């Protein structure tokens, strides 16, 4: 029909929204073992019984884990079996024929979910759909046990039955490009933002201080992040797949772990730096020189390199479970599978250790400020808001991820992958917030103004 826009009128795209794609065996809202896209394996409470039925369906030993090719093949087999079930029934076909293309799909949806004989149970609802009494059948279907158990999916199917359009599912496409344009802005803010910082310290001589030498490091880790990590990361999420190969999958992963670790550990260095620069400024100016500070930065990148490129390129970070082995064998799969060891080891070094130091240091700052050689002034209240933003932002961005990252492995995943990738991006945008936190100095202000002549 000359239709190559994104969304179309079909049962296939409809079910994919209702039933997510999961390669490993899981349990539905009922509790039955299911794999792929809503493919029921068995009602048997035994997982081994589900594995046997699964291996008899695929034709090989799957270990409860299949591939995308096998998932799609089962999906079309199930949809075809749903349609062939509708056509072979006495109650379904008289209704199915008398339905438009859209409403036909809505009927297949129910059959895809609760079987041929189950949907035929709806004597009243089907008669009403047959006499084109949509609004009455919409109300009647909302009184079934199918509605009480899966109210979200039912409400969408019932709506499609009512309107006769894809209004309940077409709202998914707006969010597709809707989050794409957001990612498009995130990349720009990080790249252009950190380049501005680096350019300022590199050009102007007044911005060449020890603290700013640490700022340069932070701006460097965030820049590469916005040039390597963030773009390639978004490029896959939108396209649903990874189209660069296995070699660049881990290399891009290596850059990720590298830059993120270097970024957070630098935030830690800056925090300690500003402690000594304030608490003991006279010793701070004498002890810590540019040479010494260059050694500190070098140490940070080595630690970051030791916890990123070193384990990854040596396949040490790799997990062993069947779903991980497949992705390591797949050229289109670049998921981040790790073992308990690397997941904890990285998190402690990348996030937790700097987190502890940054909190303890900034606490001492608020502590040793009360004990000085000195009555309810507002200069201390404003300074309190500052550290609340510095530390609060870093917390609100990375903490949700690394907590989940540690829960992601302590037990078999009860936390959705959708949440896992989302919380990584909340950490990703911290690399954009940094220049808006660590470059508000009057010297940076004047530098930023002249760098673009505003």
């Amino acid at each position: 029909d000359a239709e190559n826009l994104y969304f179309q009128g079909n049962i296939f795209e409809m079910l994919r929204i209702d039933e997510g794609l999961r390669l490993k065996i899981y349990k539905d809202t009922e509790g039955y073992y299911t794999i792929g896209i809503g493919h029921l394996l068995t009602k048997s409470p035994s997982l081994n019984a589900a594995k046997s039925e699964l291996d008899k369906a695929i034709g090989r030993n799957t270990n409860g884990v299949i591939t995308k090719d096998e998932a799609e093949k089962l999906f079309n087999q199930d949809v075809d079996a749903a349609v062939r079930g509708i056509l072979r029934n006495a109650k379904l076909k008289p209704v199915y024929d008398s339905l438009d293309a859209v409403r036909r799909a809505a009927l297949i949806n129910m059959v895809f979910q609760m079987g041929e004989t189950g949907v035929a149970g709806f004597t009243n609802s089907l008669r009403m759909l047959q006499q084109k009494r949509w609004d009455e059948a919409a109300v009647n279907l909302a009184k079934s046990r199918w509605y009480n158990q899966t109210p979200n999916r039912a409400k969408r199917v019932i709506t499609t039955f009512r309107t006769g359009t894809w209004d309940a599912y077409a709202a998914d496409e707006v969010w597709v490009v809707g989050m794409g344009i957001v990612m498009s802005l995130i990349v720009l803010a990080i790249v252009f933002g950190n380049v501005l910082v680096i350019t300022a310290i590199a050009k102007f001589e007044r911005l060449q201080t020890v603290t700013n030498y640490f700022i340069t490091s932070l701006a460097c880790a965030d820049l590469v992040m916005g040039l390597a990590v963030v773009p390639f990361g978004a490029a896959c999420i939108l396209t649903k797949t990874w189209t660069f190969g296995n070699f660049w999958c881990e290399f891009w992963t290596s850059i990720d772990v590298l830059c993120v670790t270097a970024s957070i550990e630098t935030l830690c260095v800056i925090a300690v730096d500003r402690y000594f620069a304030i608490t003991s400024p006279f010793k701070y100016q004498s002890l810590l020189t540019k040479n010494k500070a260059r050694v500190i930065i070098l140490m940070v990148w080595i630690v970051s390199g030791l916890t990123s490129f070193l384990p990854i390129q040596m396949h040490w970070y790799r997990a062993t479970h069947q779903e991980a082995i497949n992705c390591y064998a797949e050229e289109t799969c670049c998921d981040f599978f790790t073992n308990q060891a690397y997941a904890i080891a990285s998190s402690i070094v990348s996030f937790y250790v700097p987190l502890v130091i940054m909190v303890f240091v900034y606490s001492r700052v608020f502590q040793e400020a009360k004990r000085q050689l000195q009555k309810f002034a507002l200069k201390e209240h404003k300074a309190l808001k500052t550290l609340g933003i510095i530390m609060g932002t870093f917390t609100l961005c990375w903490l949700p991820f690394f907590i989940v990252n540690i829960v992601h492995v302590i037990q078999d995943n009860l936390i959705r992958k959708e949440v896992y990738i989302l919380l990584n991006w909340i950490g990703y945008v911290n690399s954009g917030f940094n220049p808006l936190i660590y470059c508000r100095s009057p010297d940076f202000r004047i530098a930023f103004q002249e760098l673009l002549c505003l």
């Epitope: 000085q372 300074a383 500052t386 510095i390």
Partner: nanobody, 120 residues
């Protein structure tokens, strides 16, 4: 929007003693560095003496042993004892306050400046 009141500068004979003063009127963050800077005729602005809010001090290599900096107990007023003055100490002494309320950086306050002349 705070103020700095300088006082003390004047004419003295070579070797004579002089006392400077700088009252910091306004609200300053607890952690700070008050001190003094000078501009000798035909020379860049140099650090004379500076005292942190934590009592510790710092002097230049050309004044250490002759100049003694100190501060009041609660009035935020820094006094600069200047003894055994030299004709090369003749300069424009500015008052200075390093605020740390921004944590990441340090905002600077300055004074009107005082003229100190030593008759060679």
């Amino acid at each position: 929007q705070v103020q700095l009141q300088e006082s003390g500068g004047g004419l003295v004979q070579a070797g004579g003693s002089l006392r400077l003063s700088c009252a910091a009127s306004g609200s300053i963050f607890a952690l700070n560095i008050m001190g003094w800077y000078r501009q000798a005729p035909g020379k860049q602005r140099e650090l004379v003496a500076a005292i942190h809010s934590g009592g510790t001090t710092n002097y230049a290599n050309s004044v250490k042993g002759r100049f003694t900096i100190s501060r009041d107990n609660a009035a935020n007023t820094v006094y600069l004892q200047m003894n055994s003055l030299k004709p090369e100490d003749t300069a424009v002494y500015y008052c200075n306050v390093k605020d740390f309320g921004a944590i990441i950086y340090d905002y600077d306050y300055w004074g009107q400046g005082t003229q100190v002349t030593v008759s060679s």
